[PDB]
Short mmCIF file of N, CA, C and O and ligand atoms in Angstrom, two decimals:
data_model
loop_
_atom_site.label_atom_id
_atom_site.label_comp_id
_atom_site.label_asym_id
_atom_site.label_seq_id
_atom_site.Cartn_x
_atom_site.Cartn_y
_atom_site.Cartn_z
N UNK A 511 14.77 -14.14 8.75
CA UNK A 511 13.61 -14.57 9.62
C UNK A 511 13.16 -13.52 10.66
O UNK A 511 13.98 -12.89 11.33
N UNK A 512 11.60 -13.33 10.78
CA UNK A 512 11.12 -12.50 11.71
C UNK A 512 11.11 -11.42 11.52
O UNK A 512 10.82 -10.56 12.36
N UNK A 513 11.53 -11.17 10.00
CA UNK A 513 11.56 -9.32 9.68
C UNK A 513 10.55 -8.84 9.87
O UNK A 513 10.41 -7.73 10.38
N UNK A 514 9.79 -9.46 9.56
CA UNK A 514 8.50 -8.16 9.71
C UNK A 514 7.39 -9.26 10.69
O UNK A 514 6.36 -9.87 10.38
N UNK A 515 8.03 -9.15 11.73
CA UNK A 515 6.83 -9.96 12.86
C UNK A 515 5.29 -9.17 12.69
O UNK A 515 4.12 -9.38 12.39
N UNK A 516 6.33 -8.03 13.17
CA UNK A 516 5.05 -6.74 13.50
C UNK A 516 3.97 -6.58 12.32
O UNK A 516 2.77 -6.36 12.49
N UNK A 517 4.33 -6.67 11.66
CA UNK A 517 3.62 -6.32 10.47
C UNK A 517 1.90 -7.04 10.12
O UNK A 517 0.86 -6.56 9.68
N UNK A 518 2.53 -8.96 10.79
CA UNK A 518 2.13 -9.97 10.19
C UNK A 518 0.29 -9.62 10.94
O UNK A 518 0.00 -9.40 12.12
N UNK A 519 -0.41 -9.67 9.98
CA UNK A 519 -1.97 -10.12 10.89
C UNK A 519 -2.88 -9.01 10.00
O UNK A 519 -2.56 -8.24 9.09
N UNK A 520 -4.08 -9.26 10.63
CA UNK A 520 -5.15 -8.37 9.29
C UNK A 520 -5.39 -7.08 10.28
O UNK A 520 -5.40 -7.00 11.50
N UNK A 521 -5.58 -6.23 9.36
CA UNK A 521 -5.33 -4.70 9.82
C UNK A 521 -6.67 -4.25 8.78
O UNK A 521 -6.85 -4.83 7.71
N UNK A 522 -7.52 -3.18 9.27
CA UNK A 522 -8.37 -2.68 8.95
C UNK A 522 -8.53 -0.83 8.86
O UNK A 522 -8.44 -0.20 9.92
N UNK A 523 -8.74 -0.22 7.78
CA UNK A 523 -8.64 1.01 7.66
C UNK A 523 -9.31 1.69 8.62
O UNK A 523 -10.44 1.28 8.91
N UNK A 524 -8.79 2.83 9.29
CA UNK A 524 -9.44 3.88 10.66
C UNK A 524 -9.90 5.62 10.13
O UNK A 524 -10.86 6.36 10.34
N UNK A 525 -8.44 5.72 9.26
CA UNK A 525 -8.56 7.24 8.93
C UNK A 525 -8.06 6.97 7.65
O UNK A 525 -7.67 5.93 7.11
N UNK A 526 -8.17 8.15 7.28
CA UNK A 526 -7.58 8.51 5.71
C UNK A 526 -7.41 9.82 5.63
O UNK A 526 -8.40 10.48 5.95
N UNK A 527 -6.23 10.54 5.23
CA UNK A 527 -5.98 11.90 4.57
C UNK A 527 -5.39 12.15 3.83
O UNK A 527 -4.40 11.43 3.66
N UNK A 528 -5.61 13.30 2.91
CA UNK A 528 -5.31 13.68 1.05
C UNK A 528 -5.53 12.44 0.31
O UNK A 528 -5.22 12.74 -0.84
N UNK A 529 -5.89 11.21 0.33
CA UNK A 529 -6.14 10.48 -0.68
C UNK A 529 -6.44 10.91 -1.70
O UNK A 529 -5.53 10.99 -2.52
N UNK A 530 -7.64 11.31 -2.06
CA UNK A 530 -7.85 11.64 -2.60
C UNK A 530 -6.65 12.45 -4.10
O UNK A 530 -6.47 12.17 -5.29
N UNK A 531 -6.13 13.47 -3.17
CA UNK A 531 -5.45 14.26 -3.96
C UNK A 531 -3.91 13.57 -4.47
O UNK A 531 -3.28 13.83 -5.50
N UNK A 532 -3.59 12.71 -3.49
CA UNK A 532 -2.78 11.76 -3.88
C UNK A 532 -3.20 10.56 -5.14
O UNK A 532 -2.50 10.28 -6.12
N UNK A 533 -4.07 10.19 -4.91
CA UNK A 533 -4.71 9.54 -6.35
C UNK A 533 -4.78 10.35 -7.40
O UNK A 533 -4.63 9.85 -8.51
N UNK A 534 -5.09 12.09 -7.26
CA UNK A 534 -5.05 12.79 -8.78
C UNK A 534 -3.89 12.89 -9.19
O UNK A 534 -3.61 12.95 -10.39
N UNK A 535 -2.69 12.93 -7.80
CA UNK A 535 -0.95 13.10 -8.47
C UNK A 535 -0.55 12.16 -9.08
O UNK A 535 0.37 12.26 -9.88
N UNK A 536 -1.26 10.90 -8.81
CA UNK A 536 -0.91 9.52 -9.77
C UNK A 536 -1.47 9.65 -11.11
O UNK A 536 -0.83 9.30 -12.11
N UNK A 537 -2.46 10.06 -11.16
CA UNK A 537 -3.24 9.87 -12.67
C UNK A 537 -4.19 9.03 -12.46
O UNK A 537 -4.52 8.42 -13.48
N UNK A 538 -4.91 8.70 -11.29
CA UNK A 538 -6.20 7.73 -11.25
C UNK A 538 -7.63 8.64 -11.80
O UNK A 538 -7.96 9.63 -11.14
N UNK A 539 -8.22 8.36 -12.67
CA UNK A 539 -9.68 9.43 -13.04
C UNK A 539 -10.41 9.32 -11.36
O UNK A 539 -10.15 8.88 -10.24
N UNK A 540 -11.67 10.20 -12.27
CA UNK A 540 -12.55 10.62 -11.30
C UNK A 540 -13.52 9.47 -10.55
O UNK A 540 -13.97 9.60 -9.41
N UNK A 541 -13.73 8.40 -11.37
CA UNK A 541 -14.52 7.47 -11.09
C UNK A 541 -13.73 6.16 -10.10
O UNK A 541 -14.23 5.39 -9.28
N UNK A 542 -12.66 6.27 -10.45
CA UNK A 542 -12.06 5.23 -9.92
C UNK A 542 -11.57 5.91 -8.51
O UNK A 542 -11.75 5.38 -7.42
N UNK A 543 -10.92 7.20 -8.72
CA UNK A 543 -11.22 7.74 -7.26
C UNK A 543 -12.67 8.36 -6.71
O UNK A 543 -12.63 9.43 -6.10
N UNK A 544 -13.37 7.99 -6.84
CA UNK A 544 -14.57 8.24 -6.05
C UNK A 544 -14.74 6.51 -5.21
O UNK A 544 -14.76 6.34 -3.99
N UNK A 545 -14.82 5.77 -5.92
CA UNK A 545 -15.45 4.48 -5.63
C UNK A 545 -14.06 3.86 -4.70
O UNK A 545 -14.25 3.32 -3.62
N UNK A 546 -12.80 4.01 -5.25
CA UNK A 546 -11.70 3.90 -4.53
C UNK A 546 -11.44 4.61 -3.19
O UNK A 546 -11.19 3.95 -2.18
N UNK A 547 -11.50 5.75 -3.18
CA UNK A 547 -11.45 7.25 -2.09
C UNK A 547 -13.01 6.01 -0.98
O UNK A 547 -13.01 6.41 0.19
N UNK A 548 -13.55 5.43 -1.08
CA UNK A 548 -14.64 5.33 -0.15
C UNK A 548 -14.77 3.62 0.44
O UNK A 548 -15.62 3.05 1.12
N UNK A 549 -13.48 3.17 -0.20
CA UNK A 549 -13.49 1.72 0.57
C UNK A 549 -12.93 1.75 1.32
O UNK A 549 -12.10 2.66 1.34
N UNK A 550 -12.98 0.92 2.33
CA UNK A 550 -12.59 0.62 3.60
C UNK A 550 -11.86 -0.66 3.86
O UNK A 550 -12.39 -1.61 4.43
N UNK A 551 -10.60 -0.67 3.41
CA UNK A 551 -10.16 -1.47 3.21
C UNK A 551 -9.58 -2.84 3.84
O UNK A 551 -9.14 -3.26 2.76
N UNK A 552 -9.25 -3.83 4.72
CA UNK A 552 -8.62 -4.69 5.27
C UNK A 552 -6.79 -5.01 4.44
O UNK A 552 -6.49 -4.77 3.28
N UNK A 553 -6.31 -5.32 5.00
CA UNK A 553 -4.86 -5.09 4.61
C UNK A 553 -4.55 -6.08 5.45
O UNK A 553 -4.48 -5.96 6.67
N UNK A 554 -4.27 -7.61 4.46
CA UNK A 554 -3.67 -8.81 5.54
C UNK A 554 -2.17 -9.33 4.86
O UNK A 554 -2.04 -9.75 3.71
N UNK A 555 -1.14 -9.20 5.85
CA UNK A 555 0.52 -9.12 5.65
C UNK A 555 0.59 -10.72 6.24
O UNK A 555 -0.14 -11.31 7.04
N UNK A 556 1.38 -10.99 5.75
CA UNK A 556 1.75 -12.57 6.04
C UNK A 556 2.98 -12.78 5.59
O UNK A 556 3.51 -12.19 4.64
N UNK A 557 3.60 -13.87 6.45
CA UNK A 557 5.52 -14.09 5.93
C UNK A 557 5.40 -15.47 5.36
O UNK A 557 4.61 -16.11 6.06
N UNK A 558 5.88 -16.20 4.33
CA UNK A 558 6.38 -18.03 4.90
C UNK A 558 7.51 -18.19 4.32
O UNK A 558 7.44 -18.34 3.10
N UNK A 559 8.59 -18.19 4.80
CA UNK A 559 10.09 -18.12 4.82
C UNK A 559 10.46 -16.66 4.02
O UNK A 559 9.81 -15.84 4.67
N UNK A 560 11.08 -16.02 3.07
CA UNK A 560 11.31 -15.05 2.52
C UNK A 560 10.18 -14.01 2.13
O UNK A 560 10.23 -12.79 2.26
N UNK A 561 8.65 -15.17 1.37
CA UNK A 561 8.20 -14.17 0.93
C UNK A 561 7.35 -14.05 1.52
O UNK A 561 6.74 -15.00 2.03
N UNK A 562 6.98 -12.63 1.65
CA UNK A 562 5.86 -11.94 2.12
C UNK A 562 4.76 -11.42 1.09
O UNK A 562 4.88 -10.89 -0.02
N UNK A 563 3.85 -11.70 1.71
CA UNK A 563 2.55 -11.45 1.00
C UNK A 563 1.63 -10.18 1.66
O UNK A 563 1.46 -10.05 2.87
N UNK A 564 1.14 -9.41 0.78
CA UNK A 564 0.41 -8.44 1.34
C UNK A 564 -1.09 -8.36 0.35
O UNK A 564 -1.19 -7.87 -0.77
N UNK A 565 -2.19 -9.02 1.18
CA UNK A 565 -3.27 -8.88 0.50
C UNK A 565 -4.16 -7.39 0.71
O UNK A 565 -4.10 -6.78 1.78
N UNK A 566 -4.87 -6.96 -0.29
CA UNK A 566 -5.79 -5.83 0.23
C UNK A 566 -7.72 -6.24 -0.08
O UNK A 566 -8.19 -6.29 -1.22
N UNK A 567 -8.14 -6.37 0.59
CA UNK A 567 -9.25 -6.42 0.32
C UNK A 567 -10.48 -5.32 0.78
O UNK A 567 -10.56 -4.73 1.86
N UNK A 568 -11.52 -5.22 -0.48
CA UNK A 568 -12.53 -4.20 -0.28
C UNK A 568 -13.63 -4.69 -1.10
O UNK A 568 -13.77 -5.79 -1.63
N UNK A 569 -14.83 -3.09 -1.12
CA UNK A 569 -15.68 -3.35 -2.38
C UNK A 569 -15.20 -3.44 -3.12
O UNK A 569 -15.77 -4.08 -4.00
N UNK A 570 -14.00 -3.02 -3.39
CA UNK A 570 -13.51 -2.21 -4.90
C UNK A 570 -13.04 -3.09 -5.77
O UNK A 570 -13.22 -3.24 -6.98
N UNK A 571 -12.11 -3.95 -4.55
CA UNK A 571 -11.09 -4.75 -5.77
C UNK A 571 -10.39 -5.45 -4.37
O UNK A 571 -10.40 -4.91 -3.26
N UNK A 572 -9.79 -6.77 -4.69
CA UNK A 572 -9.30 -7.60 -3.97
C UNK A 572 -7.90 -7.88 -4.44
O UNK A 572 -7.92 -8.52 -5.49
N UNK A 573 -6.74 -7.61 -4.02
CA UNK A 573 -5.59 -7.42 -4.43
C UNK A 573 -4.52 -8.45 -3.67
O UNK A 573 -4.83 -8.77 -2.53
N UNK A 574 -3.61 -8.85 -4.09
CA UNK A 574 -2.54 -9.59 -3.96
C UNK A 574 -1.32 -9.05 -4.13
O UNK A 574 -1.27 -8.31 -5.11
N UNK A 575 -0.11 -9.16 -3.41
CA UNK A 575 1.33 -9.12 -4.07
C UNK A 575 1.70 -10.12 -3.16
O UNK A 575 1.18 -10.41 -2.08
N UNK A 576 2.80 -10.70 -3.84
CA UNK A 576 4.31 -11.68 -3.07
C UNK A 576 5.08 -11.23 -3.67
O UNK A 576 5.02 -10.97 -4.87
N UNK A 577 6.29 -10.97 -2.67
CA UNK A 577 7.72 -10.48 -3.02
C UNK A 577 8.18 -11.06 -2.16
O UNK A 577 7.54 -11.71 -1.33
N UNK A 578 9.97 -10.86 -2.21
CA UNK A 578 10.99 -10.82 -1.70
C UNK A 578 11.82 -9.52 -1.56
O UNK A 578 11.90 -8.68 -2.45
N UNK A 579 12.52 -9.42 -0.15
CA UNK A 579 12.52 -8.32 -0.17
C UNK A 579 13.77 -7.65 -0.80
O UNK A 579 14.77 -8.32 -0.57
N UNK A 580 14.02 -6.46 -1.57
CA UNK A 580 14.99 -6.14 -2.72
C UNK A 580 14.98 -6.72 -3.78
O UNK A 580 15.97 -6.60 -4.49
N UNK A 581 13.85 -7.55 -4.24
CA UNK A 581 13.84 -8.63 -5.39
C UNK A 581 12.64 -8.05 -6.21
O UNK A 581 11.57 -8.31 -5.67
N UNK A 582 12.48 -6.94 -8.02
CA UNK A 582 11.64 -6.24 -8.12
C UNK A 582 11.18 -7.40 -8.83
O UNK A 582 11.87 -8.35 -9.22
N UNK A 583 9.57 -7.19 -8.99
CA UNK A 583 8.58 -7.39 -9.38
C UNK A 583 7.72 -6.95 -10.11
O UNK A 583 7.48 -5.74 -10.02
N UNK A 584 6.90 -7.82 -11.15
CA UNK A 584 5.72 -6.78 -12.11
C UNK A 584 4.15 -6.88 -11.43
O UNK A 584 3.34 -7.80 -11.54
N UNK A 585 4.01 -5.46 -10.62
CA UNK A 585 2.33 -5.64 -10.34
C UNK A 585 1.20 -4.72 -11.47
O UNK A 585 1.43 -3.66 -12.05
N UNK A 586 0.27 -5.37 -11.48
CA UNK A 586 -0.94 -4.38 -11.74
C UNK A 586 -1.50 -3.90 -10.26
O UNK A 586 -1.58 -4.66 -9.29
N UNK A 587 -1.91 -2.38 -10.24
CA UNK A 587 -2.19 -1.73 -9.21
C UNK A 587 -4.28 -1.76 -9.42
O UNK A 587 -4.99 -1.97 -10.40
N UNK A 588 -4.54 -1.47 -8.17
CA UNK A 588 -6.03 -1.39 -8.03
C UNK A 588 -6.67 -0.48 -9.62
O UNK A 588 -7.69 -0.80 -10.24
N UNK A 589 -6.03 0.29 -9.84
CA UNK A 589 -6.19 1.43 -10.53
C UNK A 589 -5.53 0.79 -11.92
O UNK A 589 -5.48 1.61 -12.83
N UNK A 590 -5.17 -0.12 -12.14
CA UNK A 590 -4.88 -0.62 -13.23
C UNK A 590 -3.56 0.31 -14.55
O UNK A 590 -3.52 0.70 -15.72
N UNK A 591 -2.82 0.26 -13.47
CA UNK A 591 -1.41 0.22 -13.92
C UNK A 591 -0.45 -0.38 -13.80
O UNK A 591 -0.03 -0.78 -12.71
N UNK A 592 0.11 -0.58 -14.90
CA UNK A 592 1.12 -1.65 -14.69
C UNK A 592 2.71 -1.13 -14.31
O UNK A 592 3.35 -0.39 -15.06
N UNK A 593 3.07 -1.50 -13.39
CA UNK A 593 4.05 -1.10 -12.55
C UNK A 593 5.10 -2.21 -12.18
O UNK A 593 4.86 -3.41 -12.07
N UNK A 594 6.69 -1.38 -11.95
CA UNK A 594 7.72 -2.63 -11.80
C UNK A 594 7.97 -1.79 -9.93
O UNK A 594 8.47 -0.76 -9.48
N UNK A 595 7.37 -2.84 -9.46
CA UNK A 595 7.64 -2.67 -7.66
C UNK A 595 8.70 -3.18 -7.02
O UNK A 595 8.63 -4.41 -6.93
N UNK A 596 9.60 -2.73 -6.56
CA UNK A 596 10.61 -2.99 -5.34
C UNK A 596 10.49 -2.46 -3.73
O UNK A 596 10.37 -1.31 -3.31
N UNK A 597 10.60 -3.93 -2.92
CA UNK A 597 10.11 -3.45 -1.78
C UNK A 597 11.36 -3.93 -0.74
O UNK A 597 11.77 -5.09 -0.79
N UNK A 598 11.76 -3.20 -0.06
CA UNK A 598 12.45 -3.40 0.87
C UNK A 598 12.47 -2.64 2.90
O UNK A 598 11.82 -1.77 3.49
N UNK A 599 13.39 -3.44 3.21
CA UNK A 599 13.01 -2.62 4.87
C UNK A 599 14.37 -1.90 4.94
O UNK A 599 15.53 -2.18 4.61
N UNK A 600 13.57 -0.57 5.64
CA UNK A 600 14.87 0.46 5.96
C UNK A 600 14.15 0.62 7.23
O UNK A 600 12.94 0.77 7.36
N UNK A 601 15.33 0.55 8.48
CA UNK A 601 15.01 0.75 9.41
C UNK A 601 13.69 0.28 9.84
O UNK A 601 12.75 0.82 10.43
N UNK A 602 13.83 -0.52 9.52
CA UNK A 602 12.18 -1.36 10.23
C UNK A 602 11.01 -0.73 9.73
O UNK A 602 10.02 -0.89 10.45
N UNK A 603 10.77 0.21 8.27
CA UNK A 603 9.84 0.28 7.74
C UNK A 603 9.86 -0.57 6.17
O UNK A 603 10.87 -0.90 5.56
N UNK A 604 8.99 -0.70 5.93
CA UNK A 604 8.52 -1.45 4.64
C UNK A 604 8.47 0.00 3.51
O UNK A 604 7.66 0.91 3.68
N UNK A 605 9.24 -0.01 2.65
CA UNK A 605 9.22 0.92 1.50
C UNK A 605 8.94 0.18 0.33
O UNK A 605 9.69 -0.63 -0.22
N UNK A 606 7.72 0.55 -0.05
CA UNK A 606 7.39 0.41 -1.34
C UNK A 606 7.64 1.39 -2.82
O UNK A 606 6.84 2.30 -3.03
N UNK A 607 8.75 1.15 -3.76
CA UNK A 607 8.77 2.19 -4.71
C UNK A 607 7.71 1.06 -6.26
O UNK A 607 7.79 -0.12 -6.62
N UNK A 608 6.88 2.23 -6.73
CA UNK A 608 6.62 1.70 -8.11
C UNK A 608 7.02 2.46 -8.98
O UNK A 608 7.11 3.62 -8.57
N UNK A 609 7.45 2.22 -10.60
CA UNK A 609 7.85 2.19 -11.31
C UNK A 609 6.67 2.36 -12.26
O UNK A 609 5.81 1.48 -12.33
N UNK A 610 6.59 3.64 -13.10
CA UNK A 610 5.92 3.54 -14.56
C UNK A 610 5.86 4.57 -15.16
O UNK A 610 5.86 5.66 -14.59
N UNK A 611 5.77 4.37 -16.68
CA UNK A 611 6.02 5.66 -17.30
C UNK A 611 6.67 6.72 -17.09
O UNK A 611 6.23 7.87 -17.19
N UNK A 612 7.90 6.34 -16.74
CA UNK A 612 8.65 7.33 -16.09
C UNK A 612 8.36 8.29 -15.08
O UNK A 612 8.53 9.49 -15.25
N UNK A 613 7.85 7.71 -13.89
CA UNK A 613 7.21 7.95 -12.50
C UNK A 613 7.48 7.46 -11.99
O UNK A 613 8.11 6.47 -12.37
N UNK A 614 7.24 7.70 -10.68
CA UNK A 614 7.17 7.05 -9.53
C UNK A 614 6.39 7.19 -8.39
O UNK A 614 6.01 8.35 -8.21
N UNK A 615 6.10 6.55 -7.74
CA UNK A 615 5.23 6.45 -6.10
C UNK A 615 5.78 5.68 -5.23
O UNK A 615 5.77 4.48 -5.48
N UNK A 616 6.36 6.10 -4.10
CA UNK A 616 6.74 5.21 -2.64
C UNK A 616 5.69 5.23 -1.99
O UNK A 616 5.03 6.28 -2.04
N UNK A 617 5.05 3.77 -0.96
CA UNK A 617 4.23 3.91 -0.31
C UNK A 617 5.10 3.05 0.74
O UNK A 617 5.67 2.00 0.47
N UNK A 618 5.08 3.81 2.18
CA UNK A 618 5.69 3.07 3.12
C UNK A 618 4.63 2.93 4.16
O UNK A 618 3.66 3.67 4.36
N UNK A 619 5.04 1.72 4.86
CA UNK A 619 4.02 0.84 5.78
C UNK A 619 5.39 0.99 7.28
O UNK A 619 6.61 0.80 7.24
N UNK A 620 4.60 1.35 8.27
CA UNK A 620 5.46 1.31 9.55
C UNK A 620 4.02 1.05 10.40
O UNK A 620 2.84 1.34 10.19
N UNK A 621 4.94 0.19 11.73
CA UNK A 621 3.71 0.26 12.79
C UNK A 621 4.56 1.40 13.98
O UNK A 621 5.74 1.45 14.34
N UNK A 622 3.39 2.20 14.34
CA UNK A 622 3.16 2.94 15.62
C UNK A 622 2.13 2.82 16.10
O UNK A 622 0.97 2.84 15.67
N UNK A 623 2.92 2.60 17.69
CA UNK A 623 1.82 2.24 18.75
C UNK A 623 0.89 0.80 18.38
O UNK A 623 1.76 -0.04 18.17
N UNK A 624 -0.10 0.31 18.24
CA UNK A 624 -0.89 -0.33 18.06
C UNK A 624 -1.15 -0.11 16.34
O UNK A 624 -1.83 -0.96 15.75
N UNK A 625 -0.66 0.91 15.68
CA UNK A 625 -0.80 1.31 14.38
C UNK A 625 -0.46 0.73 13.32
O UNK A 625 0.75 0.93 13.30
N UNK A 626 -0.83 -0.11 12.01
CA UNK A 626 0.14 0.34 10.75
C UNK A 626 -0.07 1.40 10.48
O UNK A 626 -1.05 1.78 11.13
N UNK A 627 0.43 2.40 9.66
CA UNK A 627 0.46 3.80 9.33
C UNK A 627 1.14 3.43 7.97
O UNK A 627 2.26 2.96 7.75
N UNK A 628 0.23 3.76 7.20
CA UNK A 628 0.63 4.05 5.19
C UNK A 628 1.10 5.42 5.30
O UNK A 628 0.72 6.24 6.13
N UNK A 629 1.74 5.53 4.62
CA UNK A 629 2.27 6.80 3.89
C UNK A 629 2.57 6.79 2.41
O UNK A 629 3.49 6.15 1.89
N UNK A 630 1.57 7.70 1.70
CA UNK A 630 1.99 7.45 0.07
C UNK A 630 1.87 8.79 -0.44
O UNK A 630 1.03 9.65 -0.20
N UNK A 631 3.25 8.80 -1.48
CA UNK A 631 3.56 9.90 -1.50
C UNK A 631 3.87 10.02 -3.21
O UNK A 631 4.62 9.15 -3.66
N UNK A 632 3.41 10.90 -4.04
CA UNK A 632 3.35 10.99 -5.32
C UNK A 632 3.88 12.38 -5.45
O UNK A 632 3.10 13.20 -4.98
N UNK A 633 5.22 13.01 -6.06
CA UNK A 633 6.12 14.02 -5.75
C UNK A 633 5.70 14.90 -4.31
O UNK A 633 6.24 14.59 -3.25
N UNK A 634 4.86 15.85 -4.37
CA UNK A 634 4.99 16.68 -3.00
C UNK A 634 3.74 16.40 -2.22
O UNK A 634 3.46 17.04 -1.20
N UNK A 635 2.81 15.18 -2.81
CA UNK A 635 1.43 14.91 -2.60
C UNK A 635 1.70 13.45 -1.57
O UNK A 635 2.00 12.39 -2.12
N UNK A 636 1.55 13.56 0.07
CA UNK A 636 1.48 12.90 0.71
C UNK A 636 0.18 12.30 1.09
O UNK A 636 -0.76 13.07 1.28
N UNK A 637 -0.01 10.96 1.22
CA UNK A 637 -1.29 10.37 2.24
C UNK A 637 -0.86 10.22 3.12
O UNK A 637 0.37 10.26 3.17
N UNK A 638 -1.70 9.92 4.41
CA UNK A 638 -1.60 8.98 5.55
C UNK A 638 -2.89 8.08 5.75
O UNK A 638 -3.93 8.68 5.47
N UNK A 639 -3.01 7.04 6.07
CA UNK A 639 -3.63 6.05 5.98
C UNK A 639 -3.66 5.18 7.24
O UNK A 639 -2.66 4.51 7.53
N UNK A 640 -4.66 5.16 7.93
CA UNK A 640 -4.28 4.64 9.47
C UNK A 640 -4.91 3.25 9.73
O UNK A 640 -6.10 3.00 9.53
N UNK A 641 -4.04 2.42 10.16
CA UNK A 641 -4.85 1.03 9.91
C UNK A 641 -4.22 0.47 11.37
O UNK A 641 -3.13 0.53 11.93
N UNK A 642 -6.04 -0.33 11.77
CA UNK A 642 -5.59 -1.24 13.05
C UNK A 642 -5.85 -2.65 13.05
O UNK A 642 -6.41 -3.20 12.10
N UNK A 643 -5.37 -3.41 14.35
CA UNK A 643 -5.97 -5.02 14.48
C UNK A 643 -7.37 -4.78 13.68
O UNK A 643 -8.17 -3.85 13.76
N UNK A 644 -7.37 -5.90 12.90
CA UNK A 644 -9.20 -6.16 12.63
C UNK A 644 -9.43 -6.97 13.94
O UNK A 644 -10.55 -7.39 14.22
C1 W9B B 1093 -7.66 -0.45 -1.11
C2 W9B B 1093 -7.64 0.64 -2.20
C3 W9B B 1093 -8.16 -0.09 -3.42
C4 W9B B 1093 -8.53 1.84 -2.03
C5 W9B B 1093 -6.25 1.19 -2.50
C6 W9B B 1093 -5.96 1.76 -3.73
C7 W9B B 1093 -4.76 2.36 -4.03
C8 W9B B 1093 -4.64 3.02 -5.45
C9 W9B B 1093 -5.94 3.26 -6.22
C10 W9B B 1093 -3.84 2.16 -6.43
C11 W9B B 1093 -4.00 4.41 -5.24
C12 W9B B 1093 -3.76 2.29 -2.98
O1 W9B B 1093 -2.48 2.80 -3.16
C13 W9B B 1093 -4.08 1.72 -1.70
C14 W9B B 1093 -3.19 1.74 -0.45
O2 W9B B 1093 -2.06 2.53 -0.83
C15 W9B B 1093 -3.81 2.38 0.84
O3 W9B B 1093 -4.82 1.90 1.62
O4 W9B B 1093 -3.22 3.47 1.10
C16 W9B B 1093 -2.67 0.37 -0.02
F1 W9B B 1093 -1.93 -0.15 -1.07
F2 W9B B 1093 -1.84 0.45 1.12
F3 W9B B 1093 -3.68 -0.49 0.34
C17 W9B B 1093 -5.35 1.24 -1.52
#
């Protein structure tokens, strides 16, 4: 209980950097990162007893997960891959690893300051992603 207080409430995109190039280390085409690379996303985290829910909403695409945390899961990603996700807290950040085709991507969620702060990282190809109160 209360793991992720901080987390809980709708958060709205501020900045963005290397996305872009982080989407080509995944394998997303050109079209899906263009139209993707330019939404502005809302990001609403919610708890009710274990599981946590993390919605994303945009133009692009309106997204869902529920998990538990250390308990993996099968998502489809915005970008339409199918991926086996495990999410857990280390040190009071949220680590996201996905799973596919013999790959991988961690995307971790921490708050600073007034901040969530994404970080996604596809081998040496980092984002940062800056999200506040909506
Ligand atoms: C909201 C949206 C659709 C642009 C989006 C698309 C992707 C991809 C395409 C799967 C890489 C993605 O990874 C993220 C995100 O990582 C971010 O904001 O950095 C997340 F998940 F935190 F919302 C957002």
């Amino acid at each position: 209980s209360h793991m992720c207080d901080a987390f809980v409430g709708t958060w709205k995109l501020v900045s963005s950097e290397n996305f872009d190039d982080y989407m080509k280390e995944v394998g997303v085409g050109f079209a899906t990162r263009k139209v993707a690379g330019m939404a502005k996303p809302n990001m609403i985290i919610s708890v009710n007893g274990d599981v946590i829910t993390i919605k994303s909403e945009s133009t692009f695409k309106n997204t869902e997960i529920s998990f538990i945390l250390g308990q993996e899961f099968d998502e489809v990603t915005a970008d339409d891959r199918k991926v086996k996700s495990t999410i857990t807290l280390d040190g009071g950040v949220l680590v996201h690893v996905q799973k596919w085709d013999g790959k991988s991507t961690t995307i971790k969620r921490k708050r600073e300051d007034d901040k969530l702060v994404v970080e996604c990282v596809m081998k040496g190809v980092t984002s940062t992603r800056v999200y506040e109160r909506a």
